[PDB]
Amino acid sequence: MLVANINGGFESTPAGVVTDLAEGVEGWDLNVGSSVTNPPVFEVLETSDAPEGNKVLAVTVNGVGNNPWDIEATAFPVNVRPGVTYTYTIWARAEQDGAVVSFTVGNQSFQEYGRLHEQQITTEWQPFTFEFTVSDQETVIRAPIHFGYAANVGNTIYIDGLAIASQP
């Protein structure tokens, strides 16, 4: 069953620590700015507890910066349709409860459609979703997930489930 978001949950990604977030997970790309004063850990893990499939991105956040955008993991590429409405669902889970993460969507024009960031996360997988439709005419989009906050510090954040598809 194809879909808009590809490997948005590291499902088609083989476990193994990442060496280049930009060219690590095809469904998920990461990017750190000078704000990241501390080096975060980007690595994929395979667990049966995974929310979607059995692969996720286990990150070890432990040191925020002077900006609310130190570690950022976006998902892409995604495929949508002009006029049709798509769905957005994702699952977050950190080794320790009390972790915050941000999951938003937007195309290359920065045009964001859905928006759900600034939320606490338990030590398990939380199913968060919503509905939206191509605002303008972007056949491809990507949900930029934010990371690098004190509420997510001293805790490993595992992300998996970022998928974009409509319902029958």
Structural domain boundaries, residue 167: 1-168
Q: Going by C-beta distance under 8 Å and a sequence separation of 6 or more, which residues neighbour residue 109?
A: 136, 138
User: In this structure, is the dihedral angle defined by the CA atoms of residues 41, 32, 90 and 163, taken in order, positive or negative?
Assistant: negative
DSSP-derived secondary structure letter, 22: G
How many residues are there in the chain? 168
Q: Is 98 left (phi over 0), alpha (psi -120 to 50) or beta?
A: left
Structure tokens at 76: 């892409």
Q: How many helices (H) and strands (E) does the chain have?
A: 0, 11
Angstrom CA distances, 82 to 5, 6, 89, 137, 140, stand at 16, 19, 20, 5, 10
Experimental determination technique: NMR
Angstrom CA distances, 90 to 33, 38, 75, 109, 162, stand at 24, 26, 11, 23, 4
Domain count of the fold of the chain: 1
User: Alpha-carbon distance 4 to 143, whole Å?
Assistant: 11
Max alpha carbon distance in the chain (Å)? 45
Q: Provide the edge-to-edge strand list for the sheet that holds 99-104.
A: 28-32, 71-79, 140-147, 99-104, 115-121
User: Alpha-carbon distance 152 to 101, whole Å?
Assistant: 7
Would you call 23 helix, strand, or coil by DSSP? Answer: helix
Cβ atoms of 57 and 51 closer than 8 Å: no
DSSP-derived secondary structure letter, 68: S
Would you call 118 helix, strand, or coil by DSSP? Answer: strand
Cβ atoms of 73 and 56 closer than 8 Å: no
Q: What is the CATH number of the domain that holds 150?
A: 2.60.120.260
3 state SS for 145-164: EEECCHHHCCEEEEEEEEEE
Q: Provide the edge-to-edge strand list for the sheet that holds 155-164.
A: 16-17, 41-46, 55-61, 155-164, 85-94, 126-133
User: Alpha-carbon distance 160 to 154, whole Å?
Assistant: 20
